[PDB]
Nucleic acid binder design. Sequence first.
RNA 1: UGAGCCUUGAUGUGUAGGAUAGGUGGGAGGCUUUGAAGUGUGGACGCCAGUCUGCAUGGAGCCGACCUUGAAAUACCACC
Lengths: 128, 234
Amino acid sequence: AKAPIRARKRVRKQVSDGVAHIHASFNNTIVTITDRQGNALGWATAGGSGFRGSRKSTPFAAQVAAERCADAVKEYGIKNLEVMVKGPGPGRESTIRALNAAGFRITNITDVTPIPHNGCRPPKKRRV
Amino acid sequence: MAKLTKRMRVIREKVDATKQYDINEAIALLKELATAKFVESVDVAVNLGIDARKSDQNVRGATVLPHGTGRSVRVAVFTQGANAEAAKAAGAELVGMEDLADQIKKGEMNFDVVIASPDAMRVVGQLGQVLGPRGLMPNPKVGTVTPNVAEAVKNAKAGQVRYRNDKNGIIHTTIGKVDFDADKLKENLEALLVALKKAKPTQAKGVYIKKVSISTTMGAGVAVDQAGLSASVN
RNA sequence: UGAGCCUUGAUGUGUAGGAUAGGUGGGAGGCUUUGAAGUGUGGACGCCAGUCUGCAUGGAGCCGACCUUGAAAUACCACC
């Protein structure tokens, strides 16, 4: 018997299709790919992609989180996305651009930021 | 008991159960279960209560049986140190090293004994090989050689067989041709059970014989009842 | 849904090779249900020339040992 192959001969899912849900938050950015029924399949973040507090809130840190999230679902054999966005953070387009350029297929962009009919009293920070 | 491949199937249409017979009906069925165009040699398989997995602690030796075995009594000796001419004159058909390795790898493979001297055994099994470890070759690891070539051939030409195991509870040995009667077979079995008790290793059981079966070459096996000389409760 | 016991089909450590020399021993081109050879080709497994499997197909035919990996063999059995 010879030595085994350098790369796998088989793979346990091949689900082809999903949705990238982004929460581009005011201090971070969090990216998660979920199947079309909303059960999450794999994820990655700004801050977990080698950036601390001081850097994790930037579109450049988010851009790398999107690539790390494309790699996170790589094994499920998904390639096709459409995109949903929430939060004030800048992780909202640099993400999509590096996602589509990291061998995945972007197809639709829709916002899913929740807005109220007035609602409850907002917090105050720094007397703002 | 039949084995399946796409390349040879003929044993499948000769047996249809894993079942055990008295010896007077086991050979009656086995004369049917021959598949080859030539009339086949018949073997026992002697399954053992042995727990050895080290080659030196498994059974090893040889013996002469009261009746024939369908083995050829053509005898060969590998030697480059020991008395070649005294071996040939003692009744060996073949002596050499240069083309004995090819002769065993050609024609009919039906040798009764392939001997080496330890003078040549170096290139027969250990550092060199000439057929690979198999019963047809003298075994690279267990004691199958002597520098008394002229004695070893004189024992061999009597229709003596060879038994050993290595990691499994197995002695397979030829016992006749399939035309044999169940008394000739039982009488060679009782002779061999003496000779396995006399060459018994420390790591074998009280119940030294697990099961016994009879099997022809190209053809199938059937199982037999007999295990004789080896009950523990006396 | 976990484990064992068991029977069988599949599976094989000496590395390399196209690959797959587990042990032991016997033996060598074989039918009665099937087909391998070989040509072509789908499946599965794998190392990329391989093995396991099937169909067109031979079915009184045909692959070993030459060839080839290696110090060394290799139709094809039974036993564990």
